[PDB]
mmCIF file of C-alpha atoms in Angstrom:
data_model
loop_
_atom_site.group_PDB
_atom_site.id
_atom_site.type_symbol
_atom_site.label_atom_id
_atom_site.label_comp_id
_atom_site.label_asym_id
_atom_site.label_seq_id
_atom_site.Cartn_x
_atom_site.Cartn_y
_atom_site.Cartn_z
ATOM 1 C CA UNK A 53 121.246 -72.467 179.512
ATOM 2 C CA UNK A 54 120.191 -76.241 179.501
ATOM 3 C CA UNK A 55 120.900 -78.641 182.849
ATOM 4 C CA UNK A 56 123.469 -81.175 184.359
ATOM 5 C CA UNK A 57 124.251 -83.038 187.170
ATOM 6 C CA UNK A 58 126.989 -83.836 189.058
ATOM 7 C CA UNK A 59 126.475 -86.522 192.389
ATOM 8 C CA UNK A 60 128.367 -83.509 193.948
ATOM 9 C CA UNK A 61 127.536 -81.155 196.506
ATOM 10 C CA UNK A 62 130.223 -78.473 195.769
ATOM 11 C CA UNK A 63 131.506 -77.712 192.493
ATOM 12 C CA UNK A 64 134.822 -76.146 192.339
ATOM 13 C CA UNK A 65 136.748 -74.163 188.939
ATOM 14 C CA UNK A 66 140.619 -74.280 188.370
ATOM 15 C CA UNK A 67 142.228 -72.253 185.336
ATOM 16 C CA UNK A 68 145.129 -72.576 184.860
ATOM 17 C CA UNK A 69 146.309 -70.124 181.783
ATOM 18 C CA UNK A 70 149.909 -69.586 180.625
ATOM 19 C CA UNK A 71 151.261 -65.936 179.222
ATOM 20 C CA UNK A 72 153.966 -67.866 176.860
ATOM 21 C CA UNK A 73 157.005 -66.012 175.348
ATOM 22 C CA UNK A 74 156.429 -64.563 171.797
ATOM 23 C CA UNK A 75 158.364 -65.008 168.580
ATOM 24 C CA UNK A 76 159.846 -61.409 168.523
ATOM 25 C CA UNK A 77 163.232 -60.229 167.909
ATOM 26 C CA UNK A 78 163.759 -60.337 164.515
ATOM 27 C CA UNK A 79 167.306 -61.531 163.144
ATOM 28 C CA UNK A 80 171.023 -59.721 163.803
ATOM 29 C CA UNK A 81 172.373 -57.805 160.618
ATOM 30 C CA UNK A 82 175.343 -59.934 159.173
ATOM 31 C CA UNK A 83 178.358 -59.787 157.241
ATOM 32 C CA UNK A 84 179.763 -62.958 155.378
ATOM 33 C CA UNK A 85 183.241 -62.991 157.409
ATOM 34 C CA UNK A 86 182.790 -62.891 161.130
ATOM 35 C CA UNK A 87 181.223 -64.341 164.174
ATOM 36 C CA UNK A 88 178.004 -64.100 165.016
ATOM 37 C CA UNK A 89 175.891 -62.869 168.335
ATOM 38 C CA UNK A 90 174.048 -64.223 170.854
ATOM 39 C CA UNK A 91 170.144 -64.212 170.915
ATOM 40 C CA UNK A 92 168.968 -62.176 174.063
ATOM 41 C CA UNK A 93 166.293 -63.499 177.001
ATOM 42 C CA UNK A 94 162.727 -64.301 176.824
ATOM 43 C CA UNK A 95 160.671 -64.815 179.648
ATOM 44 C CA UNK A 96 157.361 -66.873 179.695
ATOM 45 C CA UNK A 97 155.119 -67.394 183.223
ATOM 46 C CA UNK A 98 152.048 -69.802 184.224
ATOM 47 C CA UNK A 99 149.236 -68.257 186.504
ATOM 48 C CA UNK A 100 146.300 -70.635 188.060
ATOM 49 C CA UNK A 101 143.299 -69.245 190.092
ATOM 50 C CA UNK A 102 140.075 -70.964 191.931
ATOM 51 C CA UNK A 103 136.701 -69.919 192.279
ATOM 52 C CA UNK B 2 127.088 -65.252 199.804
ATOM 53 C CA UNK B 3 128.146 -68.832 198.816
ATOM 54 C CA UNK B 4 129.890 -68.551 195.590
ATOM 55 C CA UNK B 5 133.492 -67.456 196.053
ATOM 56 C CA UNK B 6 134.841 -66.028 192.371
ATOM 57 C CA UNK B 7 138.126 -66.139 190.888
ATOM 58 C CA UNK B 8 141.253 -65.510 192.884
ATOM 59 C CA UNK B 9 144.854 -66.452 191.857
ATOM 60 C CA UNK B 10 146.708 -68.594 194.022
ATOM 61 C CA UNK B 11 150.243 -69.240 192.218
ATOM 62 C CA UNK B 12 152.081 -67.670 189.940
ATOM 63 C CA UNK B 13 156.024 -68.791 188.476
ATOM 64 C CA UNK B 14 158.118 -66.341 186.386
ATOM 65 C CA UNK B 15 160.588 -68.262 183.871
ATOM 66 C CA UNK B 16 163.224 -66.968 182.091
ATOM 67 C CA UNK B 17 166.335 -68.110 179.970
ATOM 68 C CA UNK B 18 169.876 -67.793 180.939
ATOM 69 C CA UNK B 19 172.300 -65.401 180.362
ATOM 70 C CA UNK B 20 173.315 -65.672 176.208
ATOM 71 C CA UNK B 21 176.896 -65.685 175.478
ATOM 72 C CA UNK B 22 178.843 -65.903 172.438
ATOM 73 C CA UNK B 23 179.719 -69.470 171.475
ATOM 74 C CA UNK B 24 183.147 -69.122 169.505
ATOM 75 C CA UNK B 25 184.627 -66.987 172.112
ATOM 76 C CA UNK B 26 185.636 -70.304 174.130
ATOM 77 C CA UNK B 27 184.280 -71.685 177.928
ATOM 78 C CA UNK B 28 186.301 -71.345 181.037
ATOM 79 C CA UNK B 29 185.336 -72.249 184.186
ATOM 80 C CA UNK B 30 186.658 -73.128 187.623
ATOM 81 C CA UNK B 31 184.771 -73.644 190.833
ATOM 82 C CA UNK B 32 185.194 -71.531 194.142
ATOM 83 C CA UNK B 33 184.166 -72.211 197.608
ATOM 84 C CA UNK B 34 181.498 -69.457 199.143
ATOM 85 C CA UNK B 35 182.102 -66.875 201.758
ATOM 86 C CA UNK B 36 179.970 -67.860 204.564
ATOM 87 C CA UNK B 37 180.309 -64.176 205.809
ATOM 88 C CA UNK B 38 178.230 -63.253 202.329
ATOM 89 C CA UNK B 39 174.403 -63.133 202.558
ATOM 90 C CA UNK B 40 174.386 -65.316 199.038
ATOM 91 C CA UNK B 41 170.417 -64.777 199.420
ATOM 92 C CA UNK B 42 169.802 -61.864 197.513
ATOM 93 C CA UNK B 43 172.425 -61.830 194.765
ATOM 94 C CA UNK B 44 170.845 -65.327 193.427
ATOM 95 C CA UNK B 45 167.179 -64.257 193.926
ATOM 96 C CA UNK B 46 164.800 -63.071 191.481
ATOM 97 C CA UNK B 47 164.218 -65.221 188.136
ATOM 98 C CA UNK B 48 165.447 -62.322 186.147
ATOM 99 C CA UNK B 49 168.775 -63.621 184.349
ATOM 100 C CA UNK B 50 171.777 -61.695 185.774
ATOM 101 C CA UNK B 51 175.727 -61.841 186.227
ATOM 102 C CA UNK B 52 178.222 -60.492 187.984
ATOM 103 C CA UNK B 53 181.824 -59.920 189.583
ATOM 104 C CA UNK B 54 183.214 -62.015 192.477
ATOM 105 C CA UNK B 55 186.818 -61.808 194.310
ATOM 106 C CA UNK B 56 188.505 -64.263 196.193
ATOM 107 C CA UNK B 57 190.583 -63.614 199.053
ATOM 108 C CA UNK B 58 194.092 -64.263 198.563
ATOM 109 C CA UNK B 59 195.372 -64.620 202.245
ATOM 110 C CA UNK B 60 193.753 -64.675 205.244
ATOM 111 C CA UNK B 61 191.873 -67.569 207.200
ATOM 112 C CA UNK B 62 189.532 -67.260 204.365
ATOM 113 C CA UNK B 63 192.222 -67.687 201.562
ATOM 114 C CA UNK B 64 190.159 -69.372 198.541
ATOM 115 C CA UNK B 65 186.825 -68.369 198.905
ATOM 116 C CA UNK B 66 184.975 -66.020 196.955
ATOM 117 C CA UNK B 67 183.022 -62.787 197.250
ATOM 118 C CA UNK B 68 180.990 -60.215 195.032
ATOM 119 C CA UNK B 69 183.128 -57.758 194.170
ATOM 120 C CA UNK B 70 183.627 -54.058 195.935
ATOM 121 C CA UNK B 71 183.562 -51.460 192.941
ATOM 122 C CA UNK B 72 184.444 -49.003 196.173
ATOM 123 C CA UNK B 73 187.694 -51.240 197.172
ATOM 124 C CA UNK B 74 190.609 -51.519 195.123
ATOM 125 C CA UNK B 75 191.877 -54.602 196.806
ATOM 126 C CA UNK B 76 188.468 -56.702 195.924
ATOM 127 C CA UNK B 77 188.613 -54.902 192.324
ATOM 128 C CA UNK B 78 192.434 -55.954 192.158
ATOM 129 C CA UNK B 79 191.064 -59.784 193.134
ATOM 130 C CA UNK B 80 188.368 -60.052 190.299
ATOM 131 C CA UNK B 81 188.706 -63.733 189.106
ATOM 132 C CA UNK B 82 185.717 -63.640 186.727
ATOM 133 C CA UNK B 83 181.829 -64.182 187.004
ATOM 134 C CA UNK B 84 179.134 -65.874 188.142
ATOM 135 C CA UNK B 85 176.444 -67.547 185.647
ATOM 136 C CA UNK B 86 173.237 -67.950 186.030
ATOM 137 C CA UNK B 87 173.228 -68.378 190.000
ATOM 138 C CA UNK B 88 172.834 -71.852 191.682
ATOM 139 C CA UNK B 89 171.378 -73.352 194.879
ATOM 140 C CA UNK B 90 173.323 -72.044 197.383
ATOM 141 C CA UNK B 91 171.459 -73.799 199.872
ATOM 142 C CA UNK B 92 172.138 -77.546 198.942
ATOM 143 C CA UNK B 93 175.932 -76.344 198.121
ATOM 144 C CA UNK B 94 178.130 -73.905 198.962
ATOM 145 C CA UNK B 95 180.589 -74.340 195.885
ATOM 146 C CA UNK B 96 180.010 -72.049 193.249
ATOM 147 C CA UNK B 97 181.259 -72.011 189.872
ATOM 148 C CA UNK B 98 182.826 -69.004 188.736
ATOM 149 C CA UNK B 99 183.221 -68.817 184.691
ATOM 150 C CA UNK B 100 186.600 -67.183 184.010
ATOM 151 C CA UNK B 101 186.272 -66.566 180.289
ATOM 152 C CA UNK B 102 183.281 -65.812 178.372
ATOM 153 C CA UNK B 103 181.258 -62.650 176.325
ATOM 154 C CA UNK B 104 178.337 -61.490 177.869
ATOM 155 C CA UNK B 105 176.073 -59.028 176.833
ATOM 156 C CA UNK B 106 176.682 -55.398 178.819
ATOM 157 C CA UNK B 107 172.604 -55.646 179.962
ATOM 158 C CA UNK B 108 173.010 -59.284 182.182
ATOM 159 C CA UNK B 109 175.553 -57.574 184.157
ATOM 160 C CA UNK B 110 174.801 -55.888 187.674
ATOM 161 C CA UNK B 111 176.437 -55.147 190.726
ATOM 162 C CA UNK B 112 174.363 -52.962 193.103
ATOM 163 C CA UNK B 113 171.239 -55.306 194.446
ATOM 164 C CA UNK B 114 169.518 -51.508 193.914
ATOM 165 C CA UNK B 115 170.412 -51.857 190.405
ATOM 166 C CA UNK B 116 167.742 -53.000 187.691
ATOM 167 C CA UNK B 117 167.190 -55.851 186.239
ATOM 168 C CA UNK B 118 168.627 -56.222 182.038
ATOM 169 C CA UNK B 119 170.105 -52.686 181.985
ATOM 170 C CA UNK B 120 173.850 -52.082 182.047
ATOM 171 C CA UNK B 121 175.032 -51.151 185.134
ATOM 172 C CA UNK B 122 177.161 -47.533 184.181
ATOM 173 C CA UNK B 123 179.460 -48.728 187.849
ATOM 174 C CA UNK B 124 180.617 -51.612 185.668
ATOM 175 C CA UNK B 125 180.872 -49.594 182.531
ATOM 176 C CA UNK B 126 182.680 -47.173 184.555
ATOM 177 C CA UNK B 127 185.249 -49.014 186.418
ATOM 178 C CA UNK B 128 185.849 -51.644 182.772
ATOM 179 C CA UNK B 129 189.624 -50.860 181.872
ATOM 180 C CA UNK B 130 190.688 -51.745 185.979
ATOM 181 C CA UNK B 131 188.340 -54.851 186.130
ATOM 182 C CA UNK B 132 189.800 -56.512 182.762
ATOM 183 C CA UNK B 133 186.181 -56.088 180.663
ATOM 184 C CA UNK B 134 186.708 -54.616 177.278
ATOM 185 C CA UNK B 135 183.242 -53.104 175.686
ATOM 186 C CA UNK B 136 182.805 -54.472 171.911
ATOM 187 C CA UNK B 137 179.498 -54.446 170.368
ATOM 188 C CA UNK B 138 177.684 -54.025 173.716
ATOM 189 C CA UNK B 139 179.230 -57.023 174.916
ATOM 190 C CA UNK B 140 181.972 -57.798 177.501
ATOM 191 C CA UNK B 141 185.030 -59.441 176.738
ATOM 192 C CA UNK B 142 186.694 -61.047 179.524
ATOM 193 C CA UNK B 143 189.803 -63.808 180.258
ATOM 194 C CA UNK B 144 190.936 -63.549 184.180
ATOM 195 C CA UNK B 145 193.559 -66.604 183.250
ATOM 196 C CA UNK B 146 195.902 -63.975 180.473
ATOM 197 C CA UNK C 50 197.765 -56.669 151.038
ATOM 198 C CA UNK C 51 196.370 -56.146 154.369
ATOM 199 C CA UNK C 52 196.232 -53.095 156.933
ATOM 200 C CA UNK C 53 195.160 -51.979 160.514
ATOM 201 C CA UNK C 54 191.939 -49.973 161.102
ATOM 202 C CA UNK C 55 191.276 -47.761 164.128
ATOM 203 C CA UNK C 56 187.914 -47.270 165.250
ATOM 204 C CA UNK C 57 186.717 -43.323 166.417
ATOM 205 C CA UNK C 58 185.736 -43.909 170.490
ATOM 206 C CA UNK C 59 183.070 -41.253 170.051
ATOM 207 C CA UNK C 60 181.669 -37.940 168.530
ATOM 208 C CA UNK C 61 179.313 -37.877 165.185
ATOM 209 C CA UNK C 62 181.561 -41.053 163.860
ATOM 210 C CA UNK C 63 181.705 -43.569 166.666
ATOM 211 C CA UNK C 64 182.039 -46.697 165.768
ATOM 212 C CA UNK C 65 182.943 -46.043 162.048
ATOM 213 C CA UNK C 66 186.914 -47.733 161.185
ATOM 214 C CA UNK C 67 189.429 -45.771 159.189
ATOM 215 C CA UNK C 68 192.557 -46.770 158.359
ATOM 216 C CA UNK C 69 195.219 -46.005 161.567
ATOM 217 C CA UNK C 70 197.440 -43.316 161.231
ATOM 218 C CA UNK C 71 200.438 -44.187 162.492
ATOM 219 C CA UNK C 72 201.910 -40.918 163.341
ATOM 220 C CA UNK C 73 198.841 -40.321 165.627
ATOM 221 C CA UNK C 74 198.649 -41.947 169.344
ATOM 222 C CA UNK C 75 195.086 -41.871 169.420
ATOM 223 C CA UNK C 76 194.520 -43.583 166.168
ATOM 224 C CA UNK C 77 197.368 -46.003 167.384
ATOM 225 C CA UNK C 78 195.502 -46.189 170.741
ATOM 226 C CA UNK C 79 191.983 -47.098 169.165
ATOM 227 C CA UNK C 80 193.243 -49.958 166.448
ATOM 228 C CA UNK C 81 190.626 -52.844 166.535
ATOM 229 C CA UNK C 82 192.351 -55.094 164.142
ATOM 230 C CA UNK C 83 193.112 -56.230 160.345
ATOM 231 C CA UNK C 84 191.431 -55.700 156.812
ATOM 232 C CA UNK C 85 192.360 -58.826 155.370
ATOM 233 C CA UNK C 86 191.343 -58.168 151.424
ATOM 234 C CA UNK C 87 188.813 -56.253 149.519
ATOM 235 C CA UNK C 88 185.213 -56.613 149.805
ATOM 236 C CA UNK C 89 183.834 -54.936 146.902
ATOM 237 C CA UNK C 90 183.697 -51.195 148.668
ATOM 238 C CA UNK C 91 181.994 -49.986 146.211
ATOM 239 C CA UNK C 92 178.781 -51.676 147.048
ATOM 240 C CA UNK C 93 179.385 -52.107 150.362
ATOM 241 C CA UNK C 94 180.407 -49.766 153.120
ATOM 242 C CA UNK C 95 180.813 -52.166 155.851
ATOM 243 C CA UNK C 96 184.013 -54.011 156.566
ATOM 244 C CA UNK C 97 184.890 -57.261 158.067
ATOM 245 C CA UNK C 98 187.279 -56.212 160.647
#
């Protein structure tokens, strides 16, 4: 590893990372005549740690 | 000893509402709360969830609404329809119960020892009494017929 | 020409419509509604109900 420098005397880390919802569920099976149905729930959550 | 190494400190759940069907038609009227109710822990948890409430008809607490008793047939005999989605019932103590919609059979739960996005088999099992008729894993519901 | 289907509540053919026979109270108890016109069957063995 090469150097740095900072004018600091602590150095502190923040990640925040995100688990976001995937593209699943796939498409309802259809006829030509009727109503359709609604599209169920997805859930997506953030996260953030320190060291 | 002087390098401290990754440790979460926040985390936020998020998930979408309760899907309905569109061309079924929106009904909706709002209720005042029962302050006797512990409205706490039937709008906590960011899991998406419904369920039953009954209003009182008489009493000194005549217009004000309460999650239904599946063990009482006087609060089953009181249904007046659902609540969506859950609101602050801190800031407010008006909710707004949806009268006629289609919901899904999983977003509906009654017991607060009940899981999350399952069907609840007391709702299933008390259906014909409480007005909910089971079509394509969805409920059908209109408390104003 | 149009007619009433009844739906079977359960065993191997839940969910599966036949046409309601009248002179049966469970087929009259289970209707679910109207065939409205032909569909091409033949092809197709799923009905707009």
């Amino acid at each position: 590893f090469p150097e740095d420098s900072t004018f600091a005397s602590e150095l502190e880390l923040y990640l925040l990372r995100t688990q976001d919802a995937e593209q699943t569920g796939m498409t309802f099976v259809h006829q030509v005549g009727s109503t359709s149905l609604p599209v169920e729930a997805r859930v997506a959550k953030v996260d953030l740690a320190k060291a | 000893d002087k390098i401290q190494l990754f440790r979460t400190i926040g985390r936020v759940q998020y998930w979408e509402r309760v899907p309905r069907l569109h061309a079924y038609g929106v009904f909706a009227l709002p209720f005042p709360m029962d302050p006797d109710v512990e409205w706490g822990n039937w709008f906590a948890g960011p899991h998406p969830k419904a369920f039953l409430v009954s209003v009182h008809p008489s009493g000194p607490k005549a217009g004000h609404v309460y999650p239904t008793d599946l063990s009482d047939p006087d609060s089953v005999a009181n249904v007046i329809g659902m609540v969506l989605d859950g609101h602050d019932y801190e800031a407010d103590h008006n909710v707004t119960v949806t009268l006629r919609a289609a919901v899904p059979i999983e977003y509906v739960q009654q017991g607060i020892e009940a899981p999350p996005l399952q069907p609840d088999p007391a709702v299933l099992n008390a259906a014909p009494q409480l007005k909910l008729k089971v079509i394509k894993g969805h409920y059908f519901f209109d408390y104003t017929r």
